[PDB]
Symmetry: C3
């Protein structure tokens, strides 16, 4: 009887941060209540000032990471304010039935809905908007995020020993398909309906114009670089709702990686680069061993360094000359 279960309301946070949670379940199964408000907004996605009409969950690309435990119930109140122009919904890859909830959550502007589903499978999973006839447009406009369903006894390694993270970050990778004129400049549009056929044409090329982390070129750099300390165990959750990606920590590794994100499977060990298929979330665990700057990239290096799929970690602590040293510094 679900009415007899504890309810807990979660207040979500902006990626790449993640709301507070317990890795090992400190309660029995609960109904975990989330609220997200859809926001259609202009977003500047690159250094040139290219501005698109983004479709977001909770004002961000990606949408926030939701975190529950296996066999919790997820209850989501989805709000589509009358300041928006489009119909939206939500599909959870974690859920079973009704197109992941999409069939039950169609909200016109000025409407809201509440969906409840049982999180029966542990893993990281994509969620995204999926309105009938317009699915890839919404998804490639930013309307996706992820949900992590932790095993009730937390994460385990390939031998069944606990893996406990000290920090968790969520990197949502977004492929945008900004329509171009024949000279190659980005086109700009007066209404969503007037943009639609050109959006479809741009998507059909299958060639993204931008591939970004946390919604824009350089979003995870500078004052917004990810941080860690030598010796800290960090879990990076990475999602891509539409297109394959291949994350790589430049200077590091994925010590334990669930490339397709599902925690009943033993992790892959010692990965340099891992493939997260389009429509999947993955998770990588690493213990930092050296200080300094790391780049976290999609290792199609064109996608990383020309199209935007690169962020930074800044790591504090002691340098280990046993692991790496310059013997002879560059010289004539």
């Amino acid at each position: 009887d679900i009415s007899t279960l504890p309810r807990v309301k979660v207040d979500l946070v902006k990626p790449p941060f993640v709301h507070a949670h317990d890795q090992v379940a400190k309660t029995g199964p609960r109904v975990v209540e989330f609220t997200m408000t859809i926001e259609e907004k202009k977003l500047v996605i690159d250094r040139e000032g290219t501005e698109i009409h983004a479709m977001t969950f909770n004002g961000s690309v990606p949408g926030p990471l939701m975190v529950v435990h296996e066999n919790d119930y997820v209850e989501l109140r989805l709000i589509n304010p009358d300041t928006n122009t489009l119909l939206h919904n939500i599909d959870f890859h974690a859920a079973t039935g009704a197109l992941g909830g999409g069939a039950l959550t169609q909200v016109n502007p000025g409407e809201e809905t509440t969906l409840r589903f049982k999180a029966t499978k542990p893993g990281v999973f994509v969620y995204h908007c999926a309105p009938e006839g317009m699915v890839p447009w919404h998804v490639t406009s930013g309307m996706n995020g992820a949900i992590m369903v932790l095993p009730r006894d937390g994460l385990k390694d390939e031998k069944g020993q606990p893996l406990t993270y000290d920090k968790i970050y969520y990197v949502g990778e977004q492929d945008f398909y900004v329509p171009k004129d024949e000279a190659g400049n980005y086109k700009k549009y007066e209404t969503p309906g007037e943009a639609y056929e050109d959006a479809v044409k741009a998507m059909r090329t299958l060639t993204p114009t931008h591939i970004v982390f946390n919604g824009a070129v350089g979003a995870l750099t500078g004052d917004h670089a990810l941080t860690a300390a030598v010796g800290e165990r960090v879990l990076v959750v990475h999602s891509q709702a539409n297109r394959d990606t291949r994350p790589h920590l430049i200077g590091g590794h994925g010590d334990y990686v669930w490339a397709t994100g599902k925690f009943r499977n033993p992790p892959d060990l010692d990965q340099e680069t891992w493939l997260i298929p389009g429509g999947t979330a993955g998770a990588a665990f690493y213990t930092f061993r050296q200080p300094g700057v790391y780049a976290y990239v999609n290792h199609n290096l064109i996608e990383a360094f020309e199209l935007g799929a690169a962020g930074h970690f800044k790591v504090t602590g002691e340098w280990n000359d046993d692991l790496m040293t310059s013997v002879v510094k560059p010289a004539s």
Copy 2:
């Protein structure tokens, strides 16, 4: 001595259906006899009426699924009728030697050949035509299928317990590269030889114009939707002879997935989306838990919803409100 083994003749069926077979071998090793007739034919592949010259095994794209057990012999009689215009052959990824049989099966129109090979490795495997100098043209014109080699004691889960399916479907995913003029309209051709250089040019773009299941946009929808009942265990075999794909059951999961199709390996559990590399067949097992419509898609959603890589399951049975429910239906 192969002459002392039982022979069994199989009558193949059109995808997505699969010929009758036993999951657990009820006989010792056998010579399993198949016959396929090559058919070059016009096929309408989309809702616009785009018509291509398809090259098929047995009149279908994909070719039929063949099913044998490990250490059976597969004996194929391949017929190229004099009504065809091209040289064809067959390469089995399940076979060992002679380019998978391709070197031994070159049949001009009006010729036939019979190949026998030992199915030494259990899994789902691609087969395709591969004529010297013309390989990707034949494959991307539809001339591919798959063969399933079951373990003699049937499928097993990650712990070695039996997995028995109630139903099996074969989804062949086909990438077509229809030549376009500079305005972007599809070109139409008077002879294969006159089409060839433009086919090569179109392929070289590496951008398919269509990506379809069972040979056409919408082929697995409507009266031809896949079916199941709540509680039925379904195995979906999925092949792609040329290009990576990422299957996803919208509203469901891959409970047990062999993404690269080889049954000596433990399956991946609880998958949302799985990556089947180009030139591979994969297999996913799911037990339906909810009724209604499911979409089975390539989760590059542009490929699914704009280029054609989407089918439907219609599932009968009882709705489970514990797994999913609308708490508050969409309202103002």
Copy 3:
């Protein structure tokens, strides 16, 4: 104390060959000394005579395979002769810290540097040049290779039994993005600086013009085909520094495959095709069972047969008619 360890100097060889090494470590940990000299040179990459300005480690594309054991130290002297024009460096995916060494190895023409790192994780790993602001240009101009870090007790199968190879080959797969004019012909450039923006434009299309093994179309064919004998156990290491690939041995299999290259993980068994993500090296082990010609390809068959990603094995020995035979040779 690293000064108390044995030092061993390795003399590298040109791919696809690999320098001599022991699979099982016959000494304790060592400092393994390598030297590579950067060479910028013109390379003809296709049958049409398309000539690019390649950037190489040691004069080859790919760079040579380095082979050490887990917990050895790798000491590399990198030389950038004054006959080159560009700044280069080296990033090892096997290393920990300083962007894989890239931050410590920036060498202008006329400079050299020596880097030492501890090879703490067993596997095959990519190395590549990665100069700040120019990374994908150098990598896609050929400046990448791989390093194999063997477990001290050699390779093991999924049950922990030894796997010993008789022969090893290194196949580096290179994606080139040769700039094209609007008619589609390759453009040719007077200086690197004058080529740069067009190189960037070509890369941004995300569509390689050439995808080659060992630096050119047909490099691993004819007198340079890979060789083996029936019954020989062969390990093929395959890297791709920028783009996903899907190797396949036509007529064979990957008996044991580490698709993402890391030997602490059990191998995948009986693979037809495997996915090596961009920025990764993988390794496949096969025991030949049939003589003749095999094709080793990227199984996007357009990439293989139109863009160049195909090589040959020539295998000597006895034909096994039990595994495959022509029953009825092609006839009217």
